[PDB]
Amino acid sequence: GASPSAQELKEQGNRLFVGRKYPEAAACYGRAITRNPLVAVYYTNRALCYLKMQQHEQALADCRRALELDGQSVKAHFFLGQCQLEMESYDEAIANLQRAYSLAKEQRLNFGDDIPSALRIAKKKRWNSIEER
Numbered sequence: 337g338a339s340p341s342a343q344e345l346k347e348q349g350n351r352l353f354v355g356r357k358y359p360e361a362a363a364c365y366g367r368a369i370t371r372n373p374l375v376a377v378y379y380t381n382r383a384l385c386y387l388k389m390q391q392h393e394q395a396l397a398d399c400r401r402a403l404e405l406d407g408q409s410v411k412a413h414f415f416l417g418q419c420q421l422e423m424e425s426y427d428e429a430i431a432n433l434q435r436a437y438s439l440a441k442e443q444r445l446n447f448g449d450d451i452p453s454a455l456r457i458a459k460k461k462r463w464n465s466i467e468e469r
């Protein structure tokens with residue numbers, strides 16, 4: 337009988353995630369959330385688990401909750417944008433990826449070419465969507 341802290345469950349979820357045990361990692365992050373539900377990173381951790389499993393509605397809800405808790409979160413806007421892109425909500429996806437870019441610059445955070453690459457892909461898939469449909 338030990339009940340772990342939220343941070344311990346987060347670390348446990350990280351190890352499960354690296355092992356590609358995403359349902360188990362998601363459940364770990366969920367148990368961290370119940371212990372401290374005001375911590376936005378636990379929600380973006382779980383949202384990435386759901387994205388790996390193509391659970392878009394759950395990933396969307398976690399990203400939106402992370403933004404309620406931290407409206408300036410680069411990660412929440414980025415994974416929200418990715419989720420929306422996979423759901424083909426192209427204009428919302430691009431707008432959230434642009435917000436992630438602007439916030440990362442404001443916050444002095446280096447993500448290499450991650451955000452420009454996501455933006456370029458999102459725009460190209462949007463245009464391809466239209467050039468066909």
Ligand SMILES: *CC(=O)Nc1ccc(NC(=O)C*)cc1
Pocket residue numbers: 350351353354
């Ligand atoms: C704890 C840890 O290493 N997590 C982690 C998160 C994300 C990724 N990369 C992708 O999902 C593409 C690797 C490891």
